[PDB]
Design a protein around this ligand. Structure first.
Ligand SMILES: COc1ccc2ncc(C#N)c(CCN3CCC(NCc4cc5c(cn4)OCS5)CC3)c2c1
Lengths: 718, 719
DNA sequence: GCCGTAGGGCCCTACGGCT
DNA sequence: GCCGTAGGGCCCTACGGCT
């Protein structure tokens, strides 16, 4: 797969390790054929710190680098017989590019150690944006720097900001004239200072020990601050190996945390999800209108909101639509959206999809100045930092995904429960954990099934950590003539039916369990979930069954770990703080959704007041306009001689003729007097903290009766 | 393996489906009665076992797979008692490629599996390809023809809710178990065999290697209209002659391939895929002034609206259109790694962005003033265009090079100032001859430039539609000292892999089948043009080796012309003159109806302003007349009876804003009122005189020749 | 191992006309 | 065994908490 140059002189010869063949495209085009070589890798590479001796060598890419440098490794190294005297590390400039760097560097160190020291290893720096302002072009290398500048350029003659998710996305000359041309390039030399301090740093971030890694996050983080970026960064183009690993790994881990794996506490959506649901609402794809194809929403959410490859956007939009994964689906689906047998939905190309009615409630009131918008990834479009979520989607559905130094897992809850539960907290602020558990009995799943005890549920709700045991629903039925058989008709959340059956059949071939004649899956669309275990003559099933809960996954544990995002930060929280934050949302939403309904009833009546005057001094107005000539001077004639403002003169001249009927004069005073009542219901909702929190209560009772459904998981007490 | 079997292991009750791929082979696992119904996904088209050498099929992956699941053996060792299903259902997606797939399956079945068909084992399920809905009524339908019939057989006062079904993935497992797999409702067809020699006659004919025989076939059972062609009675039994399934399925497919996939219309020189991309670029305001948009965004847009087939071919075609070494005049704009001469494709949709070239606007010029014809799309939710206003001879400009069924096209790109000069010559003299046109149109003009040998090949091409041209890489010979020399290649023959080309060269040298050479270096780079180097062994002869290479490699390669296109709906082989007249004809009409449109809307705007003239001059009496009108219906039937104003007049009067009762805005009217009565004039003239119009068309093709007119690249060595 | 967002990229196959 | 539209699809990797 390697692409080499013409030369065979190690001194001047070099090599750019790139992400892929896609990015390594622009690379082979803008290079100098005589002296620069390219090596296409594949995505993230094996973090050699964690994996073993035999498996580190069987890695195909690690061998293509070994061969290419032609040195061997460990103690059979030989820096004498090296093909290139410059190993450049050119990874895409976005965050994931840096996590690559760190792996490559990791590898370089533990095997090709003497190479970093002799200064042969290097780091390339390709841009990640290109702001334009006339003849002015700027090159910013990460989201943080773009914040700064996007606010330093007072002038504002309009910008056209680019952005370069890959290397494949640059013209093959932008990538010579910013990254490869040995007369402009800011190539950074990898130098080794303090070998004892490297070995701690590697162990910290590439080492198995998860804790020290997390510590290291809360130690070095920086959340909402623009005051960062400071400063000098010495005008020399070398970099300390530690000074960089330390940085680039964190620039990564922070990103994976604030906007990737974990949910906001209000809406409860990781960013990919929140974007999809918005991108649906935008393009109009609502529940009343036809299904729209899936590569039309996935290609449209990519190019408008969310800069990452499809097999992430789609496989995510999918779950949101499944009834076995989302307790309350947010996406209605047409097509093969996959099964509980581990098989996955049919490709983007086939399936169609829209909103569910319940996802309109997340977006209710979103265009009405409630939540805040941040510019998308390229300054062309306007997107949401969070949605008005008029239900606690965080709990209601609950998410779970792996980050760095921390992971999360939150079970889904019944909504009538969650709402009866929040209504009680707005009544009583001082509420106790145990009291809330009268309304909110605990996890309600999609899959149904059973939970064995509040001993592990109570633990979770109180702290945020607790093991919950899950047992499937199973009947011991008989079929006459002497024999019994088992029937499972509900299963544990997140369990591969067909993978389980295998681990059951496995223990039978291997005689690790006795009394089973045959195994069978009889599940099908009309008989719901149904797995049948044929059991031997009489030998008591109750013991094999109570053996099946033990050995296999007919019984497993939800390891809870409630870690959401509160005010931009990864805070581990409990049942109560989840509701206090989510209700603070509703309180704030419904608040601004009144300051908005207010300033509009205000200017509309500001309008109407000029409308009523032009009616009863009518023929005075007409000969006032007709005498006038231009539109610049027709504003003047009515602002002076009738005492009317500007937004009251324009909306008078802009008015049509059909309004001059004798019926609309008496329809205005009655629409105007529908306003003075409507404004009276606003100003005494702002000066009254209580009538508004009352109103929130009113809307959420509505949300509960319209959508709120029955329990699925039965809790077996004791 | 790869096979999801069923519970019961008793053949005579157990059936296995064969679906196209895992995607729709899971809309099935989720529909099935896992007790008796077994699924085996394939993986798209499986090989055509007639066009195949025996030892190959015994090494194909999805054939060894079916043999196992049946469990019967093949040919001479085929045993029928050993079968594990007594119903092998062919169940492939509803579309036209599931048609093709179906013929390749039966063809295999018939070749080695004959005994299996012959005892009523092989069946054929019928999955819907549509689902129109008029309130209560849910009708299904299984091809595009059957749908046109039904869209003219309904009193459309319900308004349709048509839904398509690209595959089985697009189907919820219930509405597929129902319609297609339920022993209660389902309508499987049993595969019977009649005259064995009349079967064997359709297999070596349809799925054979006799290209002529198969085209003839097409030309005979054609149908293109198709008006309202035959029905009845489809014998109310669920049987089906094999020798008939080959004929309609294969034909009904080669039909779709030919008229709407792999062959270019003549009026705009575009396959349907292309037309679809460029239209969709036009729909999103993705013109050359606004920014580049991510590839996924367009391709995902074009696919859900216009072209229901894979991204992989929508993209790769969108790429060919944007790269300067294939499209002589690129119609798309490249921002990214959009490939190289070396045979290396672009970067997945998520990387690259794009928009229209300026030249593409000419194609899509006037597409909105009613000039070309607007059809429905594949799901009847929206409008798409049948063909573009193509304001330049795109077919010949850029050409095309696609493979249909039974036939194949190949047209080379031409220089554009040549083409319009050639078209202008035709407009002045309907009878102008081939030779006379070849004084403007010297020959093919490539993006790789280079040379051609003679016109005796060019000339056969243009006068019939067939002919063979020879293509010469632009070589040159130079010295590097002292005494020794070397050969430099600045341009290469349109459409060869400059890397495999070099590779080939190297091969003849590593195995000693050509003498003279010593070193071979590729030295092309972005900044310094194309350039490939050969080192001469001193004293040896350079002209001899350069000639030797032309023969023994793709240094000298040949483009055989085959000018086949879609004329008036059908595959016609055409010459240079025909290609121009039809295109000119198109250009004549496109203009004629633009003019018509402008005029209708010029009179519609004129009757408006006319009632706005009774309105302003008579401004006063209307005040008194509206201040008395109460309702809205009474304020209309007033100014109709008192000022002879139509309904669109008393209307566009109640529609009026008071800000126009100002002083200067009584002249804005008359000033452009007269300008309009005079503008109406300019158009009726164009419409009444055939030549006045035709002259206008001339000056518009001229306008365009000066803007996008550019030098020739390919040179024409005389011989 | 396995979950869920994210990096990354390769093979079969049909079809016609040509060395 | 290649030109270009079309059918179809599977695999390596990181990251953290738990059997
Ligand atoms: C599917 O099974 C295999 C087997 C081997 C492979 N080897 C190399 C590669 C690659 N690259 C793929 C990728 C194939 N897939 C990757 C995902 C692509 N995604 C489709 C898609 C659709 C749209 C889109 C982007 N991608 O934007 C708007 S609509 C389709 C090709 C393979 C896939």
């Amino acid at each position: 797969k390697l692409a080499d140059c013409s030369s065979k002189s190690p001194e001047e010869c070099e090599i750019f390790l790139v992400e892929g063949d896609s990015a390594g495209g622009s690379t082979k085009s803008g290079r100098d054929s005589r002296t620069q070589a390219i090596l296409p890798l594949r995505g993230k590479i094996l973090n050699v710190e964690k994996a073993r001796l035999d498996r580190i060598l069987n890695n195909n890419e690690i061998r293509q680098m070994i061969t290419a440098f032609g040195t061997g490794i460990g103690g059979d190294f030989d820096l004498a017989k090296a093909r290139y005297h410059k190993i450049v590390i050119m990874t895409d400039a976005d965050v994931d590019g840096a996590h690559i760097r760190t792996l490559l560097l990791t590898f370089f160190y533990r095997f090709m150690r003497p190479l970093i020291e002799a200064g042969y290893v290097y780091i390339a720096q390709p841009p990640l944006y290109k702001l334009t302002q006339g003849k002015q072009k700027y090159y910013v290398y990460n989201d943080r720097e773009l914040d700064k500048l996007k606010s330093e350029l007072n002038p504002t003659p309009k910008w056209s900001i680019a952005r370069y998710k890959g290397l494949g996305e640059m013209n093959a000359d932008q990538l010579w004239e910013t990254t490869m041309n040995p007369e402009h390039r800011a190539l950074l030399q990898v130098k080794l200072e303090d070998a004892i301090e490297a070995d701690q740093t590697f162990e910290m971030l590439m080492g198995d020990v998860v804790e020290n890694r997390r510590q290291f996050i809360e130690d070095n983080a920086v959340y909402a601050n623009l005051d960062f970026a400071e400063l000098p960064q010495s005008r020399i183009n070398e970099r300390n190996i530690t000074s960089e690993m330390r940085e680039s790994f964190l620039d990564y881990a922070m990103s994976v945390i604030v906007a990737r794996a974990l949910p906001d506490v209000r809406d409860g959506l990781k960013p990919v999800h929140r974007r999809i649901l918005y991108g649906l609402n935008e393009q109009g794809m609502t529940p009343d209108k036809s299904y729209k194809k899936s590569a039309r929403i996935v290609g449209d959410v990519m190019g408008k909101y969310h800069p990452h490859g499809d097999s992430s956007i789609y496989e995510a939009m999918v779950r949101m639509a499944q009834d076995f994964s989302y307790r309350y689906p947010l996406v209605d689906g047409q097509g093969n959206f996959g099964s509980m047998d581990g098989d996955g939905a049919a490709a983007m190309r086939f399936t169609e999809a829209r909103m569910t009615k319940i996802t309109l409630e997340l977006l209710r009131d979103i265009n009405k100045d409630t939540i805040d918008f941040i510019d998308n990834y390229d300054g062309n479009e306007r997107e949401p930092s969070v949605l008005p979520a008029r239900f606690p989607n965080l709990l209601a559905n609950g998410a779970s995904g792996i980050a760095v130094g921390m992971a999360t897992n939150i079970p889904p809850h019944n909504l009538t429960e969650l709402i009866n539960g929040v209504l009680s907290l707005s009544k009583n602020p001082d509420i106790s954990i145990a009291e809330l558990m009268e309304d909110i009995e605990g996890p309600d799943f999609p899959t149904a099934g059973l939970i064995l005890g509040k001993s592990g549920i109570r633990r979770a709700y109180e702290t945020g950590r607790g093991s919950i045991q899950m047992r499937s629903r199973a009947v011991i039925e008989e079929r006459g003539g002497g024999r019994q058989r088992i029937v499972v008709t509900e299963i544990p959340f997140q369990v591969n039916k067909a993978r389980m059956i295998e681990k059951i059949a496995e223990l039978v071939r291997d005689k690790k369990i006795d009394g089973i004649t045959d195994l069978r899956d009889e599940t099908s669309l009309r008989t719901g979930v149904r797995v049948v275990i044929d059991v031997r003559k009489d030998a008591n099933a109750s013991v094999i069954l109570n053996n099946l809960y033990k050995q296999t996954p007919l019984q497993t544990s939800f390891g809870v770990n409630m870690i959401a995002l509160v005010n931009g930060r990864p805070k581990l929280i409990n049942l109560k703080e989840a509701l206090v934050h989510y209700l603070e949302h509703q309180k704030t939403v419904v608040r601004r959704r009144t300051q908005y309904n207010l300033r509009k009833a205000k200017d509309r009546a500001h309008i109407l007041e000029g409308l009523r005057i032009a009616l009863d001094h009518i023929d005075e107005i007409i000969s006032t306009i007709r005498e006038s000539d231009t539109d610049k001077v027709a504003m003047e004639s009515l602002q002076q001689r009738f005492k009317l403002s500007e937004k009251q003169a324009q909306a008078i001249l802009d008015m049509r003729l059909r309004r001059l009927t004798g019926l609309e004069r008496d329809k205005i005073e009655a629409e105007y007097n529908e306003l003075l009542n409507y404004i009276s219901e606003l100003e005494t909702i702002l000066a009254d903290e209580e009538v508004l929190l009352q109103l929130v209560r009113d809307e959420l009772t509505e949300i509960r009766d319209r959508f709120g459904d029955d329990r699925r998981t039965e809790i077996q007490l004791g």
